[PDB]
Amino acid sequence: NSNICEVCNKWGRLFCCDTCPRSFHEHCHIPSVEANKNPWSCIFCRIKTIQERCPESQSGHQESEVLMRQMLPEEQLKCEFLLLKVYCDSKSCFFASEPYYNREGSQGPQKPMWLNKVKTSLNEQMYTRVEGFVQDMRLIFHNHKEFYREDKFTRLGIQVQDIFEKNFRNIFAIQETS
């Protein structure tokens, strides 16, 4: 197994996957690493198993169909993995915790949003459809663009949104387009 956390790239108290060489901090894995379960398989292994069981699940889909799916166990898992993929980028630190807004010439957003809040919402099964999760994720970056306006700090929102969007298209097998 790896000697660093797959998500945050630091050593510490790590839990090791039994089916691949990844390791995790307890609250870096999503969902949080399970108390018992020997063997234990991480979210990367669980996602690979879904595709292996149903190879046709990788054929191209329309985004509009994906968004309307109900959050059954497999879609819940895919959203947890997509959230994890955003936490795996170090620039996710800017969007993890509750923001505040006091900048000359800007007003804060109507509905603030952040990664930890989305993490809690997923854990408490508050989203009924994939659309709920995706809308909150996109809102994080949209609020950031709007608030920071012409400051070059707006680019962090662009960069982290690109990681989200790429991973969304991969995990949910969105039909490739020009």
Question: Would you say 15 or 147 has its CB closer to Zn ion?
Answer: 15
Question: Would you say 53 or 111 has its CB closer to Zn ion?
Answer: 53
Give contact residues for Zn ion (rule: CB under 5 A): 5, 7-8, 17, 19-20, 22, 25, 28, 42, 44-45, 54
Question: Would you say 81 or 141 has its CB closer to Zn ion?
Answer: 81
Closest distance of CB 59 from Zn ion, Å: 11
Closest distance of CB 1 from Zn ion, Å: 9
Question: Would you say 27 or 155 has its CB closer to Zn ion?
Answer: 27
Closest distance of CB 87 from Zn ion, Å: 9
Three-state secondary structure readout of the chain: CCCCECCCCCCCCEEECCCCCCEEECCCCCCCCCCCCCCCCCHHHHHHHHHHHCHHHHCCECHHHHHCCECCHHHHHHHHHHHHHHHCCHHHHHHCCCCCCCCCCCCCCCCCCCHHHHHHHHHCCCCCEHHHHHHHHHHHHHHHHHHHCCCCCHHHHHHHHHHHHHHHHHHCCECCCC
